[model samples]
Target chain A: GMNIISQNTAFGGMQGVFSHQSETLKSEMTFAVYVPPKAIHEPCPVVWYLSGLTCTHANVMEKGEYRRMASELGLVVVCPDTSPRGNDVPDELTNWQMGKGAGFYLDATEEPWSEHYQMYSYVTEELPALIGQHFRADMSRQSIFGHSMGGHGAMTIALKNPERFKSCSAFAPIVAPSSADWSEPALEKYLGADRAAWRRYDACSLVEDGARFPEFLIDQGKADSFLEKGLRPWLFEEAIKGTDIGLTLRMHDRYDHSYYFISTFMDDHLKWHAERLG
Target chain B: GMNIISQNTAFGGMQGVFSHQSETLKSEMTFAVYVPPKAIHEPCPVVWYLSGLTCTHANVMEKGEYRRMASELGLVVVCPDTSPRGNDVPDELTNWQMGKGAGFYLDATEEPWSEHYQMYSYVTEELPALIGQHFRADMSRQSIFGHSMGGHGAMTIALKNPERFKSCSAFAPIVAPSSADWSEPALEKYLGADRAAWRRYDACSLVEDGARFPEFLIDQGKADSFLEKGLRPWLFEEAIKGTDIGLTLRMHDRYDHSYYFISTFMDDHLKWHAERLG
Candidate 1:
């Protein structure tokens, strides 16, 4: 086990550490978890925040200013980098959209990329397994969230494993995760040519596949330039319209697809997740 | 004079504002200034924060969290982008030497860049002149601070125009402005090799040239990897060794070359500037 980055006895010796996890690829998977300051008394809810591409766990910790909100809401925000990274990891020259930072939240079965890109399994299974086994996370009340591409991951992953997520939400998600031009190449290359095969990994596609959840909430920035591109909220809404699964898709103007937008509504999402976590 | 980006009444009537000028490059040239709430009632003491490499004025205002300090101290903090940006600007991609973001704050007199990249004149003359004329800034109570290449800019600019500044400080400043490996190529391109011209630009070199300040303070992280490659305090020491400039260089243990280090000590630096401003 790698040494913990920080430990506070106040939280039942809850620690934040950077462990070197050797995955299918040579990349070192690094994630940071916050054991509640009062975890010493009892277990705590864990809300994992999966960052978008070209990012690391530190980005949210430092910039997201999530701690204050988490502290007030009594929520533990676990931030994980989008993908495993290092010089040893196989990376295309400078393509940020693929290979490293852009871990599309799906297991790549193709040659070369199929190796280190099993982010789907990492977030849903291994991450929680490690937290439940070692960390003092109350699995009884757990939820997942993300931004942009990770937002797409949160929606689809929650749809795929509804039982695992007590609550779920996202910020400006790529609702049309399957049919978008940006999603087409990756889907074709990773999943298969059969369009039916994409349903399992697509949020909107899953909605039509009878995937149901307690309640999935999401915020879309009207000012986001990509609203028409890959992040069509209408796709998810139209897909889930007849299903028992309920989805709240609210849009805000003057907000871009960046953290500024996320920050404006993060409090609401936190409150939403908190009510369900309890 | 360029129109500034303004928000509602903040620390003062304007908490954050930026000016875009001469959009001769791929991106527009932006310089941000935060008029602390105090600027409303008093001609506030102003401090300019020069950023290093690929950074624009928005970086500091958005990320630095300076409002907390600025609010309490009533400081007007001005941050200018490292260099002119835009599609047309001669972008010098880094990891090797200066070009785009590495506008060492020296006026360029060479080919390709000298046309629009004139940060020295912008910072010293244009900005201050604008602030004094249009905004509420006490020119006699002015100072400058920065990080990395920006640190270099703060020192040389202040040393070259002591009459325009009341105090100066930096975090990992490029003390040997004209000679550092990062500065050499840019200097060669924008300045050409005269060697004599460099002495005036180099802070350490300018030190013994009889240039002195009432007080010059600096902080360099001991854990900085750049200590070996880019930062060598000996040169700065040699420059001011025999001068009247009372210099304080504090070395921290485990800080790297990032905002984490600056944010950690931001309050102290702001207070230090506030003291001189008073």
Candidate 2:
């Protein structure tokens, strides 16, 4: 049974946090969903928002301010925790960029993490199925978007399962994770030394391997501290160069990697996904 | 020097948190401000947002979602921390409603508490002057709004100096603080045992004493747990009857005392203040 931890009336609808036993993660998992008022009578289009590293479902739920647009556009928003969390979970406490909150949206192949860190399957399969069974989410109509690490998750997941998500978007996503210092070390620990297995979750590598979405939206802040070292949107730009996949990459001069940047363009992303959802 | 702890470009504007030394509180204070892009070329109408008990400038900054409307309406929003905070101050740790975070937006008349619990002057005098000196906020056009205890602050401050604030608004405000249980004890501890002194900070009592605003807007949630015990909007409604001041008190069903309720109507409040600020 999905136990609701908290619920509030928001944007003329209900926003709630649900916790349940997870079959894939092998531990309890929590997720937040915003059900628009229209969904009370009809199944609404669902949008999955994966958060960045060191963030749980609460960050976007509280700061993303996505409910207003969801209410107006009649969309359901689902925010899943970045990683499985428990005392038994393996963690690299000293490095915030990896372990703990950084799931990298992959099925960890190594021990200590392999037993629980299956966010890739959890997000693409378990969580969605749970949402479909319990909520007024239209399973047939769905999209995905996120920020930073979650951005990487959204892009690769959309590319891998093009039939599942209608469109994709992100804010300061780590596009070329295989080439990024932040993700390389994490990939080594989580997925092992095989570069072939790494490409499955590397957005830029996935695009280069001919994976494509019909269209994609990316908003990157020029002032983002992680742009040059961690987030390389241009690499994705280079990879998608010859594809028919339309990409709109906006670089705002004064923005940063914080939710302030994500929220600044969240409505546009929501409207973009809403217009394209089946 | 007022130091900016962090700044991000948001919604075509600059959102920043500024920390500075305050003489009124005799301690450091932090406040958040959102300046719409229009402010780069023009001075914008300013709105003061006072947070409720136990909240710093961060709560509303994250969940309020006011920047979208502020950007569209060309308004500046200033969110001040609820109270003076530091190890040097006295605190009643046993009660969540009495000390530390709960300043009640008044200059304390009692000892120890009197040293730094001067949020009334900190907000009304120091903060505004600092804002006017360093930012593109128009001093002539200003408004105030808040939630719960902060709502009480906004209402009382506006009522006490109607010429200083163009409009007043709140969400689930502690309207009858002098009579309300939660704040009555805190008032006794902060302002001494003079019920007459308490009248200066109570919205209902201020209204009864003929302190009026040009207009007031308040949104109260029927489902709010504190509605009956600590917050009584009807008290203010009764005191304003047969008076010239216009009041719009909306009772929303299923809404609670959380930011969910505040954010749902934040745009309306911002637009209302914008329409009146001119």
Candidate 3:
């Protein structure tokens, strides 16, 4: 059972935060769900939003600016925490990008992390089941999207489980985490330095390995500080080439790798998902 | 001269945070401005937003969800800090409701606070001059609105300076602050126990004292905890019973006194201001 943390009315809907004990991560996790007004009459299509490094569910719930479109589109938005949290949860005090705040959305094979860092399973399996049980969500009709590290999560998860998602999109995602500077160390530490084991967690590798989603919409800001070193969209672009997967990679001139950029085009993404979900 | 603290491109416009030394408050102040894309071609009508207690420019700037409508309406939104802020500024750390964030949007005549707490002059005169000089703002075509404590600020200020604004509105504002539990002590401390002086700072009192704007729009949530004890919209309703001032107070049943309530009705208020500004 989940404990209701807080709920507020927005866009003629209810935006609620819930906390529950997670068996997968063996810790308590908090997540936010925005149930559109339409949910009062019927189940609504669920859109999962994964946040980036150093963010909790509150970040996107507060700043995503998706409630208006979600309500209009009758889309139920579920925002999950970036990583497992608790006093018992192991963490790296110095590296903000590697520990507590940075689960990288993968099942860790390494020691201390293996005990509680199972974000991939938590997001894909445990949390969705909870959402299905507690909310008016039509799990059969679902889509996934995220920002930065979460973008990597959305793309990789969608690629691996195309049957589950109706559509997929990303905002300034780390397409090749197996190669990117920001993700490499986390992956190496969590996956035990075996590059072969990294391929499944990397979107570019998944595409290269013949896994495919029907389509993908990626919006990247050209001015993003992380574009060159941490986010190599070109790698995923090259991998999707010669494949049947449809990719719309929009490169904006002045946008950056911030929620400001994500929110600027949030309506477009919501509409894109809504059209496809319908 | 104001220094640009940070700026982000949001909703096809620029959301900028700026800091400057304030001669009125005798301290530094920061405020946020959202320059609608239309400003690139010409100055746009300005809408000033004052925030409630325990908040800064960032609260509304981040969560108010005003960018899309402001951009569409070509309205530049200005969000001012709740109070004069700095290390040298005196504060009541024990009471979150009295000092610092709770400036009550008034010039304190009492000692310690009298030096730096001149938010009334800052928001009404100093900040507007800076905004007019720095941004593409048509100061002549301006409106004012705010939430909670800010709502009191907006209504009282607009009522007193009716000639300066085209319209005024609020969200769960403190209508009769001199009579509200949340505002009485602060008013007594800042205005020196003189209930007569407090009238100038109370929206309900302002209306009784013969201050009037062309029209006013206010949205209050019926579920708001402060509605009965602190907000008291009925006070203003009664004050305007025999007056000529036009007020449209919309009470929502399920909404509460949060940004969720504000953002939900924000579009309506912006449209109201835009229609009147034109």
Candidate 4:
């Protein structure tokens, strides 16, 4: 027997679909707004989701199993696609690892990919403003969660604009892209040759500078084949050692870089955000 | 907080990565095995899942959120994709909703589609044999569940081979394809227009004949816009009215025909299969 104890509904908030204008990336973008069931009269707490490479706002919005947890915590959740899309920008080719799907969430200054790869501005500014204007999401209650490249996005974006996002969590993030061979070329070409430039964007580096938050959460699968390669949470661990930025890094056994790992521990993360945000 | 406190390893039987002899389809397929940590090797209860038209073993295997519950009940979950696939097979070229990704889970006799669409054989024979060869799963411990076209797959396949499966369930299954227009032409070309031939593959007809399965569970989403047209579960409900079959026909409010609805209630089904099989 199954009993659904209750369901509460609230309506008319800044929601999904394409927006006509965006500041940094002039292309139309889609974002989701979670109108708290309690937002009928007052502002609500909020969380933002940044999806990984090759994913759009809809990926997290439609899947990745979030809305229910967000609803349970009575928290508003916002999700923006990885990068600017559609006819407005320099379109990239279809490849699983890069180009259109892999915007890297960085504002590309290098021509063809740079024209609309301004995810940093779109996520930090447009997303918040859109929620404030259209949805009942309270700007005050905001946190961020991401996976892989999106994990990198969440950490870098949250660290750079600590004012916008209060808490941060990542799963299988590209902890050290400059050190990661998969990204060394792109970082050199798009971000410049100085390996040191990545320091500001790296979670490990930021955490090392005593950039502390109330509570930081991260999860890594032990069996994640990419552990030594692209995703090295170890780097973050070493950086945190010298600093007082204590983090609850969950190291799961047999866990790989898939939504399976995320869904298994998502409720905990939701509740984690809830406990602090609430 | 979501916590995964228990886990166990299980294996699924797989076959056909290489063509052995004369056959319709020629792709290899695999199933999932969920073993609760509590199982002490007495052949844990199990359930099988079939996918919709054009789906591969990976579609539901990779996406459908069922592992947590399956792992909890020590239930062996076996889900096989709808049809055979490969560049070698005659696949249709069309939008995503049909063709390559949409294997209807029914065997096709039509020339263009039949050479690799003998899904009935794969589900009833090859899939089960593979499971037995590799895993500790008990054939008698098996039950089945599926969606849409897969629901048809589960029902008819179970009805035709009643001795093989225990319990059966479906989510928004395409109940009557013969009387229905959506796939009738394909069926006509596949199974011929013997009207009686059509009834053999329908779930309602199977249950009405006193096929006598222990239980048949079905959940239909009221808000599913496709219910009136493509999936009409009401016909089966009406057909089962006078039969001795035990059907748990539930109608969910405001729920749509999406994996969200399935994931929401998946654990319950897993527990159901576990409790009955043991």
Candidate 5:
């Protein structure tokens, strides 16, 4: 079930990339893992990191700069690819926003994509089971986080299963994907003519419908190119107006929608989760 | 003349890529810079980080994880492309170790390469002058470091101009290029058959000839694929014997010749330079 692609010792830990057949997607998928030194002797808390559009597990593995903090905190970090790939997977490769590498971390209800785009199950169920079986992962004390489109994935997934994920955070996530045109097209393609089905994958709607969390942590870049059209965090602010669910939303100035913005705050998010998971 | 390609605010500092017409190489060269926030008023001591073969300025800028420490240490970091790249520049595109991105960081004496592969002058003279004229750089107090082929450049360049760089460090540097077969072919091609001229660019030869630095730091990965075959740091150890130069050579277990190894020791290197430069 486990096929190791590459492994390197980094920051007093093991950084490895592995591939496995995913029954959820019916495709061979690749993911990166960072196992801390402590994971060798005892079960350690895990954080699953999802990447943005047009990104594979390598993007976060190389550019995220998460190993040092994960090592220091005795945390295991798992990074999964954003979408399905290969000839059988339907895609408009030229387009930056959709098709391949933009799975949105949801099960596709429509044709073509429906055959292989079941990342929702892959992340929430299959991947967790895989990590639990092979690694020293504390399944009960797991947190999740992501960036941009993956941020959308993190928020929606955590909201849907608050009990499963002990804590959650995001970097410049599309908080209101149902309203953001940058997200609606992908939602339409994956979920089909049913806007109602997309609610299950929309964080704002889940919050409005009283899908409460113990807390929600978000970091939004004020200078992000998509802040206006794609990531309207204001909609999220409005939805959680009168709720018991705690939210800590931070807006940083002069930061863009790139790893530069993500790397700056990743340590803080990891530390935040360390406290909650413990 | 300077042309800005891209700029981002990172770690309370500015990360920018700029291109310029180089008189040394007679080609348009690009480099990335991290100007610390403290540089807004006073000139900050700059540390130039040279990347290895088959890499551009972006690789180190994206994966080096140097900005956080650069910002903290109040140091400006420069990352220059590995080689001259253009249609007019001669290259064996199929060869990864010899052409295009593999400049070997030397003033080419051989035909074809001599026209544009003048990286030795580009780094030591032209680029430094450009940074001084445009950016808030404390030119008097500078340091240099690199990885693999570029690490060899940092060592030899610092040895040749000991007065220019205050400190020097490297990650798995090819210390004895004259002895490393993996390097001789490229040296033979760019420098021609004259082994005497090659000695000017070999770090061990410089040390044997009594070239001294204030201090030297090197981190060599024990598990690096090129450790025995290409990067024999022991040659450097033998050459520096009885020399006044302070050397701190660390042998890291299980680490490889990748950014992962480089990033792990980057903070210590930057801090090492900061103390010396200040």
Candidate 6:
């Protein structure tokens, strides 16, 4: 059972935040869901939005600017927190990229982190079941999208469970987390030095290993500071070559790795998911 | 001179935050502005948005969901901070309603407050002049709107300066600040307990005193916590009974005082202002 934290009427829909104990992460977790007005009579297609590092369910829920489009498209948008949270959860207070907010959406194999950092299962398994049982969501028709680290999560999750999502998209995603500077260290810390084990969590690695989704839509800002080292969308672009996967990679000129960039292109991704869900 | 704090590309336009030394308030202030893409070719109409108590320009800039409409409508939206801010400024740290975040949009006439709390002058006078000089703003075509305490500020400011603003509107505004429980004490403190002098800062009083704009559009959520005591729109309605002022007040169901309520109807307000500006 989930406890309602808060709810607001937005775009003729209900934007609600709920907290529930997560068996996967072994900690309490919170998530945000926006149910379109059309859900009053029918279940709406679910669009899962995984957020980037140092963000909670509230960041994208508040600034994503997706409610109006989702309302019109009748899409039930779910925003899950980036990582499990609690004072009992182990964390590196100094490093923001590897602890607490930066779960990287992976089931950790290391001791301390493994205790409460099962975001991959929390997001892909438990939350979906919760949504199905609690909300007016059409679980059969689902799509996934995210930003940066969450983008990596969305792609890898969709690729691993190809039959679960109708479409996959990302904005400035860490396409090759196994090789990326920002994510590689965290991956090593969470999964140990066996890079072979990281193939499942890396979008580029999964695609290269023959994991394929029907299609993917990626939007990257050319002006993003993390483009060169942290977020290498080009790696995913390379991995998809000679494959059946179709990709639309849009490189926007003055955009950066911020919600401003996400909000500007949010409607496009929602429309893409809506078409695939339909 | 103003310094750019940060800028981002949003909705094919530019969302920027800027800080400047204020001559009116005697303190540094920050404001957010969204320059529409259309501004590249010609000047755009200026729409001033004064924020509510305990809010900075970032609240509406991030969550108000106004960029897309403003971009399409070719309106340059300016969001001014609710109050002047500085470490040297006098503050009641315990009370959020009377100091710091709460300026009540009035030029303080009392000691200590009078020295630096001149938000009414800063918003209506200095900010406008700075905007016209810096941005591609068509100063001749301008309108104003706000939320909560900001709603009170917008109405009172527009009413007092009818020749400056073409239209005015509010979302759960403090219409009669002179009598409103939430604003009366602040008004007394800022204006030295002179109820007569408070008329210029109260929307209902301004209308009754023959200070009129062309028309007004107000939206109130029935579920707003502040609707009964803190916000009394019925007072403004009563004051305009025999006046020539045309007001279109819409009461919504189940909406609260959060940005969710504001964002849901932000497009309507933008459209209203655009129509009036044109």
Report the C-alpha lDDT of model 4 over A1-278, residue by residue, as the tens digit. Answer: 11122222212122234444666776656565555456666778788878887777666554465655665567777767776777656543644555666667676666676677777777777667767776667787788888888888888777677666668888788877767766555555555666676666666677766565555788888877778888888787787675656678888776777666666677777888787775
Candidates 2 and 5 compared: the better one by DockQ is 2
lDDT of 4: 0.67
Global lDDT for candidate 1? 0.73
Q: Scored by CA lDDT, what does every candidate get? A: 0.73, 0.92, 0.93, 0.67, 0.91, 0.92
CAPRI quality band, candidate 3: high
> Residue-wise lDDT of candidate 6 within A1-278, one digit each (tens)?
89999999999999999999999988899999999999999999999999999999989999999999999999999999998899889987898888889999999999789989999989889999999999999999999999999999999999999999999999999999888888999999999998899999999889888898999999999999999999988888789889999999999999999999999999999999999998
Instruction: Tell me the RMSD of model 4 versus the true structure.
Output: 6.4
lDDT order, best first, reads 3, 6, 2, 5, 1, 4
Give candidate 2 misplaced runs (Cα > 4 Å): none
- Judging by lDDT, tell me the better candidate of 4 and 5: 5
**Deviation from native of the Cα of residue A64 in model 4, angstroms:** 2.5
CA error at residue A149 for candidate 2, angstroms? 0.9
Candidates 4 and 5 compared: the better one by TM-score is: 5
lDDT (tens digit, per residue) of candidate 3 on A16-101: 99999999999888999999999999999999999999999999999999999999999999999999899989999888889888
Interface RMSD to the true structure, each candidate: 7.8, 0.6, 0.6, 6.7, 0.8, 0.7
lDDT of 2 by residue, A1-278 (tens): 69999999998988999999998988788899999999978999999999999999999999998999999999999999999888788899999988888999999998778998999999999999999999999999999999999999999999999999999999999998887989899998898887788989998788778887898899999999999989988898888888888899999997899989888888899999999995
Docking class of 5: high
lDDT digits (tens) for residues B146-245 of candidate 1: 8888888898888888887888888888787565676776777787777776676678777767776777788877767787677786678766665677
lDDT of 5 by residue, B98-168 (tens): 88889888999999899898999999999999999999999999999999998999999999999999999
Question: Using DockQ as the measure, which candidate wins?
Answer: 2
Error of 6 at B56 (Å): 0.6
Model 1, residue pairs in steric clash = B11-B37, B12-B37, B25-B86, B25-B87, B26-B86, B26-B87, B27-B85, B27-B86, B152-B174, B204-B239
Question: Which regions of candidate 6 deviate over 4 angstroms?
Answer: none
